[PDB]
Amino acid sequence: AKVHGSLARAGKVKSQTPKVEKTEKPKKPKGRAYKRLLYTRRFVNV
Amino acid sequence: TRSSVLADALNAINNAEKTGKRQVLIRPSSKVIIKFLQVMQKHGYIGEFEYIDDHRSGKIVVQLNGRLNKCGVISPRFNVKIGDIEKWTANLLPARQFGYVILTTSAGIMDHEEARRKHVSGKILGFVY
Amino acid sequence: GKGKPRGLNSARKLRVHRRNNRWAENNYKKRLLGTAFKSSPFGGSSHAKGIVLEKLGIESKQPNSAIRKCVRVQLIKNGKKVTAFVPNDGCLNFVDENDEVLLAGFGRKGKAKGDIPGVRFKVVKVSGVSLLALWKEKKEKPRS
Amino acid sequence: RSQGQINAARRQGLVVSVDKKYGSTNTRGDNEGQRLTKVDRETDIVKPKKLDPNVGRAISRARTDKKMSQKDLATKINEKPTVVNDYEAARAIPNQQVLSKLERALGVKLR
RNA sequence: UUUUUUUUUUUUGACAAAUUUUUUUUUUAAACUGG
RNA sequence: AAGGCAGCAGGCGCGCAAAUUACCCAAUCCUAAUUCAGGGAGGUAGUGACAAUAAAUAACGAUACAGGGCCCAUUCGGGUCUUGUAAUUGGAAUGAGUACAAUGUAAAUACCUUAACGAGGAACAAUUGGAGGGCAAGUCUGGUGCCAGCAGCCGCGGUAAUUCCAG
RNA sequence: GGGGGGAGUAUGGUCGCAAGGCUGAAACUUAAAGGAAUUGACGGAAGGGCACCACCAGGAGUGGAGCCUGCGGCUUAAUUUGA
């Protein structure tokens, strides 16, 4: 061929993904309180 | 041809410290080489040196005592203001607390330390450590 | 030694020799020839608006075997025709002919990127909104 | 452990137990990391938490016969559909993280 | 008496594309009275 | 017959690319015959994620399971040492905002004060990019099957994708 | 001299009834091109050995005929299939 490209199947995978909704979860703390969660969760060894 | 006799003399000394010799013979000799060796002598970097009197220019034999790492020349003889000396001592001296940069002021050939307490400056000749 | 002059009265030679050898530098030449103004498709600009002429499919070079889904665009301020890659999937559906897209550089400062041969540009905005918004269904393309 | 004393014991001292954890941050927990040494140094065969006698039989029906399939059930707990298959009747070594997600996704309180 | 001493060559073109990848684990042998 | 916004505000055009046809001489100063008049100089406000500074999005508590190592052990137990999962509850504090007032100001707006309201997961709910290496963070699951696409670079994808599209 | 190409090409000048020298770009394209050495593999390279799954000297043949036995092909409802 070496003349054209088949533009037919653009988006063929994002169209056929079996979409699923983001499950609702409790929110996470923000700001200084998130560094609390982070930098204890990386250091829980009592 | 020979462009500077100070560079030849300091090359000769530096080559014989490396090989292990205890003496050199340099040729020719000038007042600048005599004064540069006198500054090296008073800081203990070389031993005794003797000047052989030709009728031409003279030769010098210099006794070496180890303890010399490099003597070098700076060519061209850059003009050095009195605030630029610590830009040279930082560049080509191994530490801030030994080693000398020899200058040529109108007060004479001298190392950088007592050019400072004389508060003079001028052109640069070289360095010893 | 060392092949360059060293004498104290020789600053002219060193300065003119540095000048002549600066021309071997890639970006010094383009700064002093104005190659961005005259030769580059964008007029030395980060972005340029265009007009879509056709949808293109370009074969990816080895060792990749995909079809890259780009478009051919004619710029307003210059009239030059460039090929621009249309990013992640479904965006070629969001672009059509005569949508007045906005273009940017493709990352490599005037060079092709990845397995796409001969494309130096990408579309950012189509119909004046975004491609991120249209891809993520955050905004809607105007009816045109 | 969890905020019981780790703030109460920090009264103007600020350093007791401030050392770093093992350090994966996405690989799963170390609930058997103690048992991994014991099976390494003991030079015989040991039985690995043999079976699932009634937590298999009774909880497969309460979970899956209600509405769901294992292909669905393994998708919401994020494991391969043969993992739930060997949690059905028998033939598994039960680890804590998989059995915990099995419990909290379908409610039946048998551990 | 340095003394020893195998002489050789007709013809043989070609073999599509992509690929094969290795990390250093023990934080675990830590438990004792003061009468 | 009349004209010259590279003054202020605004419009068209051009473009990747840039604000209100607002208020006032009260400050800074200027001019005049001059203390008084005039000043789109200048100042005030509107638009303004150009840059820059400071720093909300929570704080104290109470309450529990499930293991694993070792020790002693009857085997039913503790008695430490650690691993994860939350999940139900309580009184306290506050400003983001809505605003009497006063202050601010040429007059206002806003700030700084301050009566009265103003927190329990449904909100008063933080995003932007990433998770093979460079380069910090999954060899978890579903889809696709050198297609779609990713990928600054090396590379990924041809039916068990740590790299695409998703949770 | 300043990554590999484009290219010692284009243009202008110059040396000119010649070939052609000298001077000498850019657009565009590209993730390596390259240097030295290492271990294998290969050589219509060399040297030293070795083998009737190599030859030499020979024997018995097979290939030719009929059959029966596997394979391919064709046929078939199927002529199950691997190599």
Contact C6 B75 (CB under 8 A): yes
> Alpha-carbon distance C86 to C69, whole Å?
6
Cross-strand bridge partners of residue B64: none
To the nearest whole Å, the CA of A17 is away from the closest chain C CA by 13
Place of tokens 């002021």: B105
In A, minimum Cα distance to D75 occurs at A20
Provide the token pair at D28: 């799963």
> Alpha-carbon distance B70 to B128, whole Å?
6
Chain F bases closer than 7 angstroms to a protein Cβ:
14-17, 56-70, 81-87, 121-122, 125-126, 129, 131, 137-144, 146-158, 164-167
Cross-strand bridge partners of residue B79: B123
Round and report the angstrom distance from CA (C82) to C1' (F146): 28
Chain C residues with CB under 8 Å of a chain B CB are: 6-8
Place of tokens 């092949």: C3
CA distances (Å), origin A19, targets A16, A23, B46: 8, 12, 87
Domain spans, chain B: 1-68, 69-129
Provide the token pair at D99: 């059995």
Query: Which residue type, as a one-letter code, is found at position C102?
Result: L
Query: Which residue type, as a one-letter code, is found at position B32?
Result: V
Secondary structure of chain B in HEC code, one letter for each residue: CCCCHHHHHHHHHHHHHHHCCCEEEECCCCHHHHHHHHHHHHCCCCCCEEEECCCCCCEEEEECCCCCCCEEECCCCCEECCCCHHHHHCCCCCECCECEEEEEECCEEEEHHHHHCCCCCEEEEEEEC
Cis status of the peptide bond prior to C87, with omega within 30 of 0: no
Provide the token pair at D75: 């998708």
**Interface partners of A (3+ CB pairs, < 8 Å)?**
C, D
End-to-end Cα spacing for chain D: 22
- At how many Å resolution was this determined? 3.0
Strand F contacted by D41 CB (< 7 A) = no
> Alpha-carbon distance C7 to B75, whole Å?
8
The phi, psi pair for D81, rounded to 5°, reads -70, 0
Question: What is the CB neighbour count within 10 angstroms for residue C101?
Answer: 24
Per the CB < 8 A criterion, the answer to whether B110 and B40 are in contact is no
Query: Which residue type, as a one-letter code, is found at position A19?
Result: K
The phi, psi pair for C83, rounded to 5°, reads -105, 130
> Alpha-carbon distance C48 to C75, whole Å?
7
Per the CB < 8 A criterion, the answer to whether D101 and D87 are in contact is no
Residues of chain A with Cβ-Cβ distance to D14 below 8 Å are none
Q: What is the DSSP string of A1-46?
A: --S----TTTTTTTSSS---PPPP-PPPP-THHHHHHHHHHT----
Contact C57 A13 (CB under 8 A): no
Contact A10 C90 (CB under 8 A): yes
Cis status of the peptide bond prior to D94, with omega within 30 of 0: no
Residues of chain A with Cβ-Cβ distance to D21 below 8 Å are 42-45
Residues of chain C with Cβ-Cβ distance to B77 below 8 Å are 8
Query: Cα dihedral angle (D10, D14, D19, D23), rounded to 10 degrees?
Result: 80
Provide the token pair at A25: 């979860």
Q: Containing domain of residue C115, as a range? A: 1-144
Report helix, strand or coil for D62: helix
> Alpha-carbon distance C24 to C33, whole Å?
13
Report helix, strand or coil for C47: strand
CA distances (Å), origin D28, targets A25, A37, D24, D38: 20, 18, 8, 20
Structural domain count of chain C: 1
> Alpha-carbon distance C35 to D103, whole Å?
68
Chain E bases closer than 7 angstroms to a protein Cβ:
17-19, 26-29
CA angle C66, C71, C74 (to 5 degrees): 155
Round and report the angstrom distance from CA (C84) to C1' (F149): 17
Strand order in the sheet with B59-63: B23-26, B59-63, B49-52
Tell which of D21, D27, D30, D77 to mutate to test the A interface (max A CBs under 10 Å). Answer: D21
Query: Which residue type, as a one-letter code, is found at position D64?
Result: T
To the nearest whole Å, the CA of A35 is away from the closest chain C CA by 30
* Lookup: nucleotide whose C1' is closest to D34 CA: F69
Per the CB < 8 A criterion, the answer to whether D80 and D74 are in contact is yes
To the nearest whole Å, the CA of A24 is away from the closest chain C CA by 20
The phi, psi pair for B52, rounded to 5°, reads -80, 125
To the nearest whole Å, the CA of D27 is away from the closest chain A CA by 13
Question: What is the CB neighbour count within 10 angstroms for residue D89?
Answer: 13
Put residue B67 in one of left, alpha, beta given phi > 0 → left and psi -120 to 50 → alpha. Answer: left
Chain G bases closer than 7 angstroms to a protein Cβ:
1-3, 26-31
